[PDB]
Amino acid sequence: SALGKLQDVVNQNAQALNTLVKQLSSNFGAISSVLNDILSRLDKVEAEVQIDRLITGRLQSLQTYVTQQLIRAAEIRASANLAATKMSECVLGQSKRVDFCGKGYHLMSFPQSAPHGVVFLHVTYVPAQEKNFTTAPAICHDGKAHFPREGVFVSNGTHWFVTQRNFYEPQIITTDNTFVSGNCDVVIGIVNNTVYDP
């Protein structure tokens, strides 16, 4: 069931050709589906009326096939433009576009060829073992409100740390991993903790 997008493209094009071939068996109101029956049984003034019913229906049948192949080719081209964009952004790049190259934060993609298609093996970082913490938007020290340069202020219950957002790594809060802006009184939910000066 994995290959279903490529197998359905193979199946749709086979179904379209089999439909086009099977439409040669249709009379369209002629005395026979077989053009050699008409030409072996009827003389030209009578035959040309029957052949024109076959021409009309076979030409309408072939117009129907080509029209649905033009619409299907536009759908394959939209998929090929998407595959060409996935190639550039995720094989030749790393994409910041959420869920463009697999679920999770994109690390890299590898292209593999497949019949009438491409397969991308999207390598993604998925965060996996949550822990809960108390958190603060900012921290009061000498009346100064401190904010983290990178990451978040968190507490294990008794102590306050700064960590990056996507992986728990408790660092001691210092004037190097934080920046000041203004006094405490402006910030909704600021907390009081010492900020160490290295």
Binding site: L3, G4, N13, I76, S79, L121, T134, T135
Partner: protein, 384 residues
């Protein structure tokens, strides 16, 4: 399903097989209850016909005509009809019929058709270019020859009352130079009140039940019902946007019957793959179960699938939030689809979750890029 797919193996899914239709229970005939036999003896067997410069039109109305009494007769040299076939005329009926009665030379019958031209057809008996009805003609040398120069000649249905006055020497020794009688029956085949009809006997009326019907020659099939549609006195039929008839005044009791088509809808067939089971469920799309275990979905009446109060991921999508699957002793079940497990995110104005570990996912995305490059030599496909 196997015949619909043209296959002996069928995969897990829902397949739109042939459209279900409620069949007509009875065939109803509703015709005007008018008893007179039509005066066609006064049309065909009048002692002398009028001259073609001044042809005579008889209105036939308020009577029953068996057209077989005419068409079965060996007496007529032609009975050519336009817009109707003479075999059908008893099954069908009209507001009025007009008989144009006159005599011509036997050579001239060719001129009496829609779109013709010549010293009758462009001069004294122009038919409409879209004439509906029959030209009936026969040799009358034994009746109308004497010669009998009184058979004078001189837009559609104009009467032609130097000047173009001309005559034929109709003598009994004349064959194309003999007199021929013509009756042209012109049929006023409007969707308006009928008064000339075939001998077809009317049934009783039937309501609230799917029936085949014939009103004054309008064939159809549907549920006849009483209606609020205020037909004005001149109106006999009402139409839909498709020009299909949507209501009728009954020709004997003047009530307005609304016509609804007999109930229909796709028979979707729900199957696990034949690889696993031959057990099957059927959805009558948009049908109500009173019209067909049994389960009314909004998608239609579903039959042969057990309704379950649990919810699961969607296996086979039925519609309107319902799905089906093969589950336990195995059986087809139908259920409201689960969108996913419910989750209270543990939000508070001071709580954060930080991930202490990760997983490297590798996920496979499959994209079409090309399709088979066909080419068709259209001359060899079409003409071989």
């Amino acid at each position: 399903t196997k015949c619909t797919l043209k296959s002996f193996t069928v995969e897990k899914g829902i397949y739109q097989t042939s459209n279900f239709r409620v069949q007509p229970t009875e065939s109803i005939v509703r015709f005007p209850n008018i008893t007179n036999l039509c005066p066609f003896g006064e049309v065909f067997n009048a002692t002398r016909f009028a001259s073609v410069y001044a042809w005579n039109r008889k209105r036939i109305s308020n009577c029953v005509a068996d057209y077989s009494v005419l068409y079965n007769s060996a007496s007529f040299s032609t009975f050519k009809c336009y817009g109707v076939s003479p075999t059908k005329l008893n099954d069908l009926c009209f507001t009025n019929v007009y008989a144009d009665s006159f005599v011509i030379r036997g050579d001239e019958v060719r001129q009496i058709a829609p779109g013709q031209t010549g010293k009758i057809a462009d001069y004294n008996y122009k038919l409409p270019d879209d004439f509906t009805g029959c030209v009936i003609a026969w040799n009358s040398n034994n009746l109308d020859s004497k010669g009998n120069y009184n058979y004078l000649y001189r837009k559609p249905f104009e009467r032609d009352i130097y000047f173009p006055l001309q005559s034929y020497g109709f003598q009994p020794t004349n064959v194309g130079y003999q007199p021929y009688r013509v009756v042209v029956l012109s049929f006023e085949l409007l969707h308006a009140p009928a008064t000339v009809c075939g001998p077809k006997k009317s049934t009783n009326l039937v309501k609230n039940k799917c029936v085949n019907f014939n009103f004054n020659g309008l064939t159809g099939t549907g549920v006849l019902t009483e209606s609020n549609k205020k037909f004005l006195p001149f109106q006999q039929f009402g139409r839909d946007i498709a020009d299909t008839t949507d209501a009728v005044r009954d020709p004997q009791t003047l009530e307005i019957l609304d016509i609804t088509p007999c109930s229909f809808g796709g028979v979707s067939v729900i199957t696990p793959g034949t690889n696993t089971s031959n057990q099957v469920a059927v959805l009558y799309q948009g049908v109500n179960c009173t019209e067909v275990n049994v389960f009314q979905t909004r998608a239609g009446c579903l039959i042969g699938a057990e309704h379950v109060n649990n919810s699961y991921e969607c296996d086979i999508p039925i519609g309107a939030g319902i799905c089906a699957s093969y589950q336990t002793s195995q059986s087809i079940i139908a259920y409201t689809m689960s969108l996913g497990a419910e989750n209270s995110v543990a939000y508070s104005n001071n709580s954060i979750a930080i991930p202490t570990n990760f997983t490297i996912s590798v996920t496979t995305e499959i994209l079409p890029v090309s399709m088979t490059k066909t080419s068709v030599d259209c001359t060899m496909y079409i003409c071989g």
